[PDB]
């Protein structure tokens, strides 16, 4: 019932500002999730598919963003880097079910689309399940000024580049990550 709109969606936000959508007090099926070979990776870390038909639908979360193809391998527990230190840090605990699948024809046109953004510079790397939308200059060099973007003062975001003539590891993969909790 509830998540028929979080997979077929025509608009996925970029990674640095995702959309945590909770579902509550409504039935779920999870047979739409498995028995479909359209997905690339269907890793689940704590609980097992074809078993989670228990009383778990107390605010089941579902994050969603878009990253390049060989950075699905940083949406594992642990596994530090540059898309899991500053954008989406999973805990060393129960991540629900990290799900990813190739998308070259939906979020990428012939003109070299670069509309999706990801952070590159952030001191004091992220806690588990925390979002950072604060667009402020880095200021890692000289004395704190009002922001001039000249030298050793970088813009905190950067585009990707999603041409359809790239290989596998530079094409956008629409990653959706479930999460579960109790009371």
């Amino acid at each position, epitope marked *: 019932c509830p998540f028929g709109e979080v997979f077929n969606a025509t608009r996925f936000a970029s990674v640095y500002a995702w959309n945590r959508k909770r579902i509550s007090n409504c039935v779920a099926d999870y047979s739409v999730l498995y028995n479909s070979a359209s997905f690339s990776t269907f890793k689940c870390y704590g609980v097992s598919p074809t078993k989670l038909n228990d009383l778990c639908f107390t605010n089941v979360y579902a994050d969603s963003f878009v990253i390049r193809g060989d950075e699905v391998r940083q949406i594992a527990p642990g*596994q530090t880097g540059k898309i899991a230190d500053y954008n989406y840090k999973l805990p060393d605990d129960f991540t629900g079910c990290v799900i990813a699948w190739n998308s070259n024809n939906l979020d990428s046109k012939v003109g070299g689309n670069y509309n999706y953004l990801y952070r590159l510079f952030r001191k004091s790397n992220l806690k588990p399940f925390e979002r950072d939308i604060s667009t402020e200059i880095y200021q890692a060099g000289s004395t704190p000024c009002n922001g001039v973007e000249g030298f050793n003062c970088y813009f905190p975001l950067q585009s990707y580049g999603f041409q359809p003539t790239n290989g596998v590891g530079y094409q956008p993969y629409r990653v959706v990550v479930l999460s579960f909790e109790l009371l």
Partner: antibody
Amino acid sequence: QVQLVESGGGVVQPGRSLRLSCAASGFTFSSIAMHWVRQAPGKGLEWVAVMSFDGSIKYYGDSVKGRFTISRDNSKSTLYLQMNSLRAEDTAVYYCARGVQGYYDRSGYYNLDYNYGMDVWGQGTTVTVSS
Amino acid sequence: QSVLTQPPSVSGAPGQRVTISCTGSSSNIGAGYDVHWYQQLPGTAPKLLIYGNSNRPSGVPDRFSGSKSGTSASLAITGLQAEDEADYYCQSYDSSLSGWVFGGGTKLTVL
């Protein structure tokens, strides 16, 4: 805080056995897989054995097929490797390297993960087989 | 000897770009698995450098990048300095032997 310290190297005649130790601290040992890799002195690295999350899935390399035995314990956070019928080509520095975690796919069977490397490596002790 | 084949020793001048090739068979790398890369400083324990064919963990700088072109991947160092004289082993996973494979080791030095 995260490190893997070992002990247990020595001089063994070819034919008798030895137990290898690999202590663990700084992280959660009770959920992550573990890998053993060895280095011949001068030559490159080679793979030895892997142990899964719970202790039901094990694999070994090509040169150690059957004549080795791996077993761990989550309680005292210590990883063991038992050997018997040793040869003279096993004289190598033995590392224990932390693996990645593990996953259940749709079908639902735990699968050791294959696409990940070995993040943090131990200091590694040397064994010596000679006459 | 080893399952993966790579050049045993290649080097170059500082500030230039060196390609450490790492080619394998169609049973392990070409089957759909991901290469990785290590860096063994002389006399010590290696560290992870690149995993998942393009990434870099927390701590390794921006100079060490890589790729995976079909059935033969390659590591690329841009702006190399004197403090990187170590060896660089590439590894993968194999479906036939059902075990991890490694490389022959590349001796990279500065001139």
